[PDB]
Symmetry: C5
Subunit: 308 residues, 5 copies
């Protein structure tokens, strides 16, 4: 079946939209999120006018020519299924189908608990006799209401824009259509799960500055280092790979450095106290009591400024 | 093959049911549970009357028109197989098939050991010449007897109701059918596996309030913190992702906070006892002995009230 | 192709069997074990008699009607392939095929190291003109010789019985065929891997009853608790989910309780010894030396009686 | 298409071979290794003689009859693709295809770092008019050159032999063909990764025999037990399931037993030294210094003899 | 459809290229990386000349003969889809398709944080009437712009060369085409995540050379060994299998050896200090203070020289 003949006044501007249904899978490490949503198309063509002698008409999927719409960014062609084709008697085709696919949106965990991500879908079509203006979207058919699913994100925006980019070959003048879904993580879940316990263990380490027993100080600091490594093991099963950097990955390095400095300070204090310099050891101890929380706050503020 | 012609008195009300067979897979993190069950349809159509010149008749799956029934919430179209079609001589079609699919029911682990979940299946059909009343269910063909499988849930209810909701496009007046399976976790397995050992380790930590040795107190409290983090590592392999909150996830935070407060109290007691205030240190120690279990019980009751 | 016409004396009793080849995959958590075995069918039909003017005849899989045999309990229809069809000149069809599928047998880890499981396969067929007696098995074509594979089980029995159970719809009088494979775990591998080291760590904890140093006692008991949690982490990667209970899962809880009681006893002994009651502390210590192994043996015997 | 007619002098002896390309996947726990290799067949048939009026001829895969060659041991039928069919003018067919499949070779980790395994492939064919002698292999077309891939094995032998074994039904006289690939692990990688650090931690434990401090001895031995359990956790992610036994799995049990005996010795020494028997305690301590390395060497030699 | 007839002057030299789109999956342990890219072909053939009585022409994928191009190194045949065929009126075919497949490039983690890898793609074609010169590449259609994806690599080179290698059978004179993509890891992410914390824990261990307390020294060194094993557990989830060797895997062994030597030195110092040799113990202690960092630097330089 060939596309309907044009009037040559303008290329066939097919209206398209995608109503999200279930963006269920979020493979952060694989940078692939899997969705099973619905896509709706509406375009003008010659059909049953029924002005003389209705309500709605429905043909078969293999009868009417449907424009070939494909996603640039998928592991494989979308697992789709034609749901409802409406040949409106005023004259148009309304083709609604249900597709499921992996979308291949590269997440960016530069600021992991407080990240704002943008899922991307790129639409392309082929040209047979004339170009296509598929990017014309009514912005009314798109949108998922909500569900409290394993996706703990809050949806901010669903902008859809025409972004003509350079193709792999660029043989034709085809322009892809951009669906950008900007979402924000609900970070409250992570404050008592990844952030607060780490600070608690760090403060347990710091409680070694109010003690004079070198052996108890060593127990506190090194057992706290072990506890922090174990808690990092616990946390990193939740975190993605992140082979570049992270805000919460630099706080962990800061905490490692602070354990190192705490060990150094405890050793220095004990060396001074054994070398018969109790006054200097006490001065260093009190300075550490004041300084370690202060330096930690300063480092956290500096890291927040660097990342945010 | 076209649907049988109607009398125009009422739309074709096809009776449907699903008899659960094996809801074997429960991917909590993926929020997908996989089932391989049977679906039965019964509807009126013209066929062999056999009033003159039986028992049962059976046609081929590709011969009789079967209504297109699809699931709203699946990763892919159900992997089905026609099992038995019965063209009853009194006149009807009884189409029983075996399908297997992922159902995409978002679990809700707000109260993980004591959760009551509701698995959801949505049914939709297409319209060719007249609407359909598929939601008419006899409620007799549905139901799985039981099996002591890896599913440790106790089935409470299997309500099936007609829930006309807004579709993605809502071009037609199609109404989906709701299958809701309300089940409850058997929580007894978790009391001696996730709950009691954590309390045992916490009480081991608290046994540091009956001691005067600061170094032994530090050993108890910090080694117990390490043990609690290791036990949390052990537990979280069983738990799902839960990127929002949890009842058992807030008890863990409470236990972390209690370890922090225990360390603070031990340090305060040692500081007072070294600063030549044994009376105040002993008073704080006895108050802690009384208070820590009491505050833990109060916090647990408050959390239970907040979550239940 | 239609089934061969009957004599109406008796329904077509097709003989069936399955010769196991490789039951390679055992997904205990998923409760699915994957096998790639052979199935053989033998039944009477009209064919080349060759009494006048052999040895064997072979037709094409798409030529002869083969009864539709399906498995009740599979994720998807078996990935089969026709291997050899023998139209014996005396008159019969011998259809041997190689199928691979997941079998969906729910394991039961109530007694994990010493469990005896029963893998189940259910066979069903469709009826076109007359019923079928597929359950008639010669019990001679079934059976795998052996292999020392990743399956560490010892095969006990391969009983095959006719078990007419209620179907999902029960429209026809079809009766399924039961293949039950009863196997037993070789538990010797687990005694030096899951059982003996746990007892060794527990006894290391108990060696704190032969000491008077409270701080060394705390080190022994709490570091042993940490070691036991780490060993439980090591073990549970081997174990399945078991969301209900386990014999080896209740021994772990008993060991947790014994660590708790050991900490309590050590704290009581130190409190008495500090409160100037060395005689009572020594009496409690000696009683603990005698009692802890005795109570552990009694608890283990009680648990064995409860589970076995 | 039917097989070419025979001369009845001998059955059609088709020459076969498989040239390994990428045996990339080695799922030790699943006992399945996945390979994507090439298979070549050569057999005599009537074709273009071209003695009057060449170089080579090529037909279509669906035109020439190719013998049905299947693998006994695969999860599913090989994912193959016809690559090159050469109808040599002297008269023969040379059919080379690229197949990828899981091979289902049960590994045997009785001696894990020093194991020598034998990957197995079984070939079977069907008979239509005459038997087949497929087992006739030239042994020249087989073989992979090499690659330094994730397979850290050194290939020893590629023996291919005719092994007529009892089939599942044995209706015909078909004989399978055996491809056995004997390979050996490069064990050097494991000496500094699984073996040497464990010995280092054990010796750290033994350094408690040169000390008189019971509390420091307890710290050494029990913290070393914790370290050994953590290192076992680290190692076992690399190791397969091994539900039967292992050489490196019995060394771990020996090390657990040695930690138990070390704790027992330390407790005995402290009990004697507290009970006012310093001479006996020192004698036991020196005997332990001499004996523990000696007994460990003896146990390792005994285990090596038992396993090798 | 047959390939277009040749002029016999030269074999059909089809120009080919692949424009990378998403090399998203990098299964280091499996040694398979999955890409969904575009491939473009351009070749001369007889078609619409349109010199008398254009712009572009497009046929159907099943109409024009397209050369059979296959990848030597894939798990399965590429999941491709024809995108755009351009029959240029000057006379040529430009066939652009989108394929997704696993590429089977064996990574080489001899120097894990600082590795430079070379992903390999091998192209082969079949011969029907004449040979092919597919290796003729314009080097202009290839190339991915960039994306900050889960791939943390920096692309260095995209060399494409003709590498005629020995085939599995080498029946024809076919020559494969080599696509080599040389990339380099961005190692900065790993310095504060795998390298610096390990050094921090090692230095914490070394702080035991500035102390005289044997029990505190044991606490430092053995608790630091536990911390290092836990951190190795944390790191190895990121690392691949590496069953041969590694630069970062030999630093870990060096650190294990240094913990062993630190324990030995502490034990020697305590033995000398107890055996009434404080001068020798102090001399060994100071020599260790100087030597351990020096020997560690020397060992690291030696390892870097050996690996780089």
């Amino acid at each position: 079946v060939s596309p309907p003949p044009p009037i040559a006044d303008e290329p066939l501007t097919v209206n398209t939209g995608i109503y999200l249904i279930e963006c269920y899978s979020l493979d952060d490490k694989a940078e692939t999120f899997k969705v099973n949503a619905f896509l709706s198309l509406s375009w003008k063509d010659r059909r049953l006018a029924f002005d003389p002698v209705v309500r709605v008409k429905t043909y078969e999927p293999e009868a009417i020519w449907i424009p070939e719409i494909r996603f640039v960014n998928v592991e494989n062609a979308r697992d789709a299924d034609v749901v409802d084709i409406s040949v409106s008697p005023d004259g148009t085709v309304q083709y609604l189908e249900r597709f499921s696919a992996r979308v291949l949106s590269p997440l960016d965990f530069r600021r992991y608990p407080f990240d704002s991500q943008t899922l991307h879908i790129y639409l392309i079509v082929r040209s047979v006799d004339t170009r296509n203006i598929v990017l014309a979207v009514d912005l009314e058919k798109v949108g998922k209401n909500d569900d409290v699913f394993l996706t703990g994100w809050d949806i901010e925006s669903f902008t859809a824009v025409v972004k003509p980019a350079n193709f792999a070959l660029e043989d034709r003048l085809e322009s892809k259509l951009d669906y950008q879904l900007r979402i924000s993580r609900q970070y409250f879940s992570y404050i008592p799960n990844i952030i607060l316990p780490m600070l608690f263990i760090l403060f347990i380490s710091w409680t070694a500055f109010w003690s004079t027993s070198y052996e108890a100080n060593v127990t506190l600091v090194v057992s706290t280092l072990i506890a922090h490594i174990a808690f990092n093991i616990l946390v990193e099963t939740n975190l993605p790979k992140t082979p570049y950097m992270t805000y919460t990955g630099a706080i962990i390095f800061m905490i490692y450095l602070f354990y190192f400095v705490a060990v150094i300070e405890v050793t220095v204090q004990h060396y001074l106290k054994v070398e018969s310099q109790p006054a200097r050891a006490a001065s260093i101890t009190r300075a550490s009591r004041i300084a370690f929380p202060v330096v930690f706050l300063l480092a956290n503020i500096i890291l927040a400024f660097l990342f945010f």
